[PDB]
Symmetry: D2
Subunit: 334 residues, 4 copies
């Protein structure tokens, strides 16, 4: 009953989505498309990882097919998305992870290839957005092209949903300390539009602008126009942290904030929102599958209406597991 | 007319204070005390620096005296501060920079050594605090033991004072992304009280608690009980950034915020508070002598009463230059 | 039939030795001594690791005993090694891992505490040295205090034994690119004897002197006086690499060198010496239990008598597993 | 009498060559060509540098010309090298620094643009190679297209010339610990041919192959076929170190090696080869203009015929200053 999933692009998001699908077993990958990576280089890329270690399983190439844990995978090298034969490979859902086909018209090229539904693993300008555990019940199966937002939005959402439902966020601001990105430059390099992102990633802190805090209002319509923020990109490897400063409507002591977050992390948001009281650091969340983990000891409250909350998230694994978790919920809705 | 300055401790703060005094020429160093560093090791430490480069000048040892630019410096190796003969060396002001004598009773041990006034280069529990450009006119020359707060407080004070005088800060919260220091551990190590600070500094983000935002209320009494914050220690080398989220009383567009900060950085707070509109990163402020530099392009405003302001600071040079600038103002008040 | 092992010191070597003993199950830990770490801090230290991740198992404190996987461990806080009651705790073998008791007289303090044999996890000036897979058959059970040399020696030994037995090393020089050490300073700090090791570990390359290449001649007596080398400490986290340049007596093509190393890694030196032909990097050997892994593609030969061989080693896990493997061989010799 | 120099490409080598030319004043830059960087982005790139700090001088844009220290510079955006009007701009010598036109036929496209001579700042397959201080007297002014080798070759050459002239190098091997460059990937990325260079530069050590040691035999013909080596790329920023292991013909104690290197660094190779006896680290050579600096305390000798010598070099500044120094010697030969 598991759905057939095709992956477009074998970048970081595509490789970690394939790894999450093979680790969890909720879906099955039958096809991968990349015009710039050959088969043996795909074996090398999937087998070895600097951040998450070696793959737990067997990966090899035979008869022109990538074989992972005994499952052969069709490989395409097509550059035009409308020319990829997804229907011949048996793929029903396609993950668009290259980051260059994000509009509905550009990502709709996969549907005449034989695919049924397209999931975009990036923010989209016109496709509907879904975050697991927040608004994923609003999916209604008549939508062909949807998006899964981003890692920062997936971390911030469930958290802001719990605070708003209990205390009424009047307004808020967010700052995220983010690990390096593939788009960043090892040394000062030529970035055409974003001049700050062309500077050396190993030596710098690099303020950046983001739309993840504004995208929460699309997913939670009551918070529309009430959230904004920015980001800093520090020279770490994988794990990021979200810093939210908000004004509340109802009075809330910090012990009352800790109680409702801990209760939400047990029953409704189990596996999506985490809770800890230990003295954790950033490497304690490496390969953690939670969207966000609340740090009780790191936050601070000025008074009963003005608080600052600290959350952690693995921007690689957690987000890649949410793409798989969204796809399984779509297949149960057919 | 320059005052004679003794330095207690040849750590990072003491070496950069000596370097700032020799670079600026406002004061003169006549004596250095350290019980664990010998003379030739002092020559080696002062000559070479990983962060700020080689010393611009000549440093050598002769006749048991450290000679920097032709000026001989008396060296003491005493462990008891009451036994150091500051008066025999001619030192009138003593910088207490070891970080272990911060109370008035502990830092008052230097006065029977012959010293007149003691400046503590750290926050103090009972000594009066002074930040240059904010409340340094309140010094009245009958105070023998004063403190110079900390680098984070010196960065945050100027901006806050300008914002409160023009728009009326109702309440605010601060987050600082801080570079690694000397108390942090290269690899997971045993920190007795602060368990998070014992983890590996190269691999981690490490939330920390700080009292720099609360100490602004001691320096600006109108903002008492209206500011608080925390910090993150990322694996960079020298430059930190302050992130302030505040609620204003009077309406303020972001263009009006930029105008009053730029005007304050020219006339009254010249050399203390900086202003830039370029696409800067953290390494652009290495060896910068400003206490804080306002980043106009990095901040964001949600509405006319809720803003987030970004400022930078070299926590080594700027702060060390403020210790020299405070000492010169004290000598003019005699 | 497993021996009872006591651990003196809960530093990096002691914690990874405890982790290796609980992961492998060859020995059992019954007692840990550390005068500066309390019980709950021991739980925190053993549970979380920045390099090797979270501990796979349960660790908690009850009734003053550290309980790991249901096994209670006696905790001592004694500072004098002759006062530790090893015999009351049931410990038969004691690992001296603090790095300050390395001579036979200093490490012999544990024997009137009730212990039978002492294994020093460091190079020793007068204790006999043993490297697993090279000279560990020379142990004769009448030796009470022995040493396990070091990580670099454990990496270099197996390799040089295979090359000398097949081709006759006439002379050889060595260089190791080593990851940071706890003794290194996060920022420029005061190192009393080694002035280079006091400089900032994040920003520097730092040449260092080592006696690991000379200690191979103690373990292989035919190579006495024929090996020497030095080291570089680069800002990585865990994995080091050994670079050996040697002159051979008999002619040897590089394909003949690859054949005898691959054959030795299968039969005699299985699990101690590894072999790979893939395009590996340093993070591919994180938490690898081999003493050394031969990199076939990285080495180069100038002619048939002058070659340069490249080997990898995890200086934390591999070495800690060799301490356990040495202790199990000692218990089978009783 | 200074020659007019055009620069093709505004990458790292081109920007540091322009900076070295404006700092030294031996030549003058009149023209820069880059098809992907506009004028204001050129101002931003030249003004700010993460490694070497802010530019000491004034840089601004006016009337479509880059103005540095009052000197206007013509800017071209041509992609075909044969279409660049070097003769209209007055440029006589052209530095080819893009790294893609290295053969004589490809780099000879500049000559119908009006240029007279082409200097390639890279190794070339067929152009003659020149290293300053070693074989630069062999230039005879009838050569139109020459090359300047590479940074590693420029570091190794002067050293091996001194050792061979005094002691007779029989054979030798070299290892260089190199800082990260621009071709490396911030995180695991797709490198088509060199699979190891696509792994994450921040987390890895990354063995690499180089032809710098073999290229010494082209510059010193007596050492042809007697040198080879490889490299390691560690996550530092700028400074690299060369590790040479050689067999000598004549006996040489290490004090005799230190004497001839120190004498050569004073008279003949002043400014090219350096000498130090201090306890230096890698950041002590940041922005140092020497091609190589001999580290007396870091090397080691096994016997009188088998030594290991350690040398430092700033692979950005030193090499860029040698391109300027080579061009000035060419202009004096006309």
């Amino acid at each position: 009953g598991k759905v057939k999933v095709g992956v477009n692009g074998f970048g970081r998001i595509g490789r970690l989505v394939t790894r999450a699908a093979f680790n969890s077993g909720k879906v099955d990958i039958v096809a991968i498309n990349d015009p710039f990576i050959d088969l043996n280089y795909m074996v090398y890329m999937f087998q070895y990882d600097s951040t998450h270690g070696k793959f737990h399983g067997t990966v090899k190439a035979e008869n022109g097919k990538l074989v992972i844990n005994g499952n052969p995978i069709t490989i395409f090298q097509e550059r035009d998305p409308s020319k990829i034969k997804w229907g011949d490979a048996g793929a029903e859902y396609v993950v668009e992870s290259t980051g260059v086909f994000t509009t509905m018209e550009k990502a709709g090229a996969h549907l005449q290839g034989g695919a049924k539904r397209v999931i975009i693993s990036a923010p989209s300008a016109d496709a509907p957005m879904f975050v697991m555990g927040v608004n994923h019940e609003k999916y209604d199966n008549s939508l062909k092209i949807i998006s899964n937002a981003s890692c920062t939005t997936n971390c911030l959402a469930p958290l802001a949903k719990v605070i708003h439902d209990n205390f009424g966020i009047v307004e808020g601001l967010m700052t995220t300390v983010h690990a390096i990105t593939a788009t960043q430059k090892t040394v000062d390099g030529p970035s055409g539009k974003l001049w700050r992102d062309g500077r050396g990633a190993l030596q710098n802190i690099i303020p950046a602008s983001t739309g993840a805090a504004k995208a929460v209002g699309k997913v939670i319509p009551e918070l529309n126009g009430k959230l904004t923020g920015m980001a800093f990109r520090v020279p770490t490897a994988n794990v990021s942290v979200v810093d939210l400063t908000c004004r509340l409507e109802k009075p809330a002591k910090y012990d009352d904030i800790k109680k409702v977050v801990k209760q939400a992390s047990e029953g409704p948001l189990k596996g999506i929102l985490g809770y800890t009281e230990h003295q954790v650091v950033s490497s304690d969340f490496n390969s953690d599958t939670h969207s966000s983990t609340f740090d009780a000891g790191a936050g601070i409250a000025l008074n009963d209406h003005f608080v600052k909350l600290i959350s952690w998230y693995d921007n690689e694994f957690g987000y890649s597991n949410r793409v798989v978790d969204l796809m399984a919920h779509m297949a149960s809705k057919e």
